[PDB]
Design a protein around this nucleic acid. Sequence first.
RNA 1: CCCCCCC
RNA 2: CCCCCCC
RNA 3: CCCCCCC
Lengths: 351, 351
Amino acid sequence: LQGIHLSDLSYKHAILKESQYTIKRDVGTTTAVTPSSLQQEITLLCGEILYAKHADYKYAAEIGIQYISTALGSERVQQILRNSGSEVQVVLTRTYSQMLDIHGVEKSWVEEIDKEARKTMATLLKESSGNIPQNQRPSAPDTPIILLCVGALIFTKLASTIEVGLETTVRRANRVLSDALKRYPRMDIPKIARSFYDLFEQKVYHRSLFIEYGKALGSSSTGSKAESLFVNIFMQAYGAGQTMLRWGVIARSSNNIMLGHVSVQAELKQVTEVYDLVREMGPESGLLHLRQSPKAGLLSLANCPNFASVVLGNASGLGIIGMYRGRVPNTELFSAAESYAKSLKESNKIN
Amino acid sequence: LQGIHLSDLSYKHAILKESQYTIKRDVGTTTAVTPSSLQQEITLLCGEILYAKHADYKYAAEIGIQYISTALGSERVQQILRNSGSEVQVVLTRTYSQMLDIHGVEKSWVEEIDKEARKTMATLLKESSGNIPQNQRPSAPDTPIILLCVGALIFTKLASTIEVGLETTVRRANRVLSDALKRYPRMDIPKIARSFYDLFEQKVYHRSLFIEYGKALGSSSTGSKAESLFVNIFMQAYGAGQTMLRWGVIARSSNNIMLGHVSVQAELKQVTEVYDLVREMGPESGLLHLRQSPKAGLLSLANCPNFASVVLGNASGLGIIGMYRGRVPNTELFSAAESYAKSLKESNKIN
RNA sequence: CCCCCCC
RNA sequence: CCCCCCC
RNA sequence: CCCCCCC
């Protein structure tokens, strides 16, 4: 009975990876970028969104992506979009009287944001004593990263739902971005997060662009505190869409007794197959659900209901499960694992 | 008695694989493709099938395959058809006044579908408040993938019968494609599935084309949620036509006691030969029955009636057998294995 | 189909 | 988010 | 001959 072995998942991944033909999508579409020579101007825009109370926050995400394009460069951004499987033709950004003319972003919107910000600045300078510090002004060099930090907060919740994503973004940005909120008292995290979620859902190649910025930022030798915060949040998104695997390795670390049942031990083989596929893909496996790589779903543990039920029960026992919305297929294993997990958490045993 | 060994199955596969002559079929036949430059138009057609209630859904499968041809490209599609063992001459697609002239698809049909869809859109715009969202319109970019998702649902049931295939397609598409059904309330999954089943049976080289699209989609770096769903369904088709091998590895994982009988232990040698042949073919072994590769049938376990009966009994005991229509040759082994499988399922043993 | 918590 | 002492 | 279930 040693030879009765199939290895289906490795074969599926081998089929998906070994393709001699490249897909082509978004052939007739275009997107906007801004060259690095305009970074000092786009920073202003990315900051002129933050300290004023704007009626429409619709294209804030596009301005954050514009700053990313200034950071990497226009040619590198076109190359990134091309290697992301999307045949989008980059459209460059121009200036006019100065202000920016970003493609697909109406000049009325940019003018409205700039005018609202100028009026707010004049009002806060006229009434107050005219002692605006260097960090409270729109031309601060970390304002684009503060906007991209809200974007990165909503990036970590792209596997989740829209409403859960917005609530988590607001809750976490009131604390993660407390200093920016103090510097810019009137920044509407809900609307900016909504804009970023809309951008990430509509233009999926910008997820790849956004990921490339994270790499280009994490590999840098120096950075401000805003960029370090952005990288911290960006890395919090790494295992997005695959929390079941993380809870499985947690259960294995917990030495759950219900892991030794007959059905769990029956499915452990294909479970180890899923983990081997994770290792096979390597570093980019974590970014599969963030990118909406169609290859995602090879890492699903839905084909092991007893293992999934035991792991969710262990998570519920440790209190980790929180408000996870997954299904528990086998309730008896879930409850038994929960009981053991509570017993282990409550008990204090030292070796 | 160590040398009394034959290895017939390896020899049969060696004969089949090591052929110096290539077959030629469909020599005088032609098929239609659409170049990528028309993708933005074909998308419309692939979506103009979905939100209107059409009398004839006869060539919907050809429109899905046309979108696949736009995605891969005309030259790559001709090459795919050539390497699939079929000498079909590709015929390109043209436009006229705009609409498409697909070869083998009557222009009356295309005009009828377009006119029905335009009339339905006008009716739903005139009566309603004229607030059609961006996902409910025919020009949505995931509509071709929604049609190909119905096609992929009927693709997983190509080893099954036509009626079972259509019933499963409707049942699964009311749930898998619930969001598309909400977006397009009036999409007739039965008729579209019938069209796709007819296409897959008549033109078998389009199975190879359809498989190539799955690879070109699974290997992509990014994709929409529709394409991820399509790849999920496409991978659900992987072991099609070979569920007996999957249930055999399930039985081995279950540690069924009836595996140790004399006749089961007698046939385990050639059973392991079948599994070794699976490993020998490698990743493409799963796609043999989907492709109707004549080499399929080397993976049949019909020459091991006692092993097949024990495995089917184990499956019936675990409740996995469902409504499987295979034959049980040896009823005593089937019943004994079923009894042990029920006993193991009912019993909760933890190591 | 998949995903779904907290940081 | 992270960091946080003494030398 | 083979295939045949569910997701």
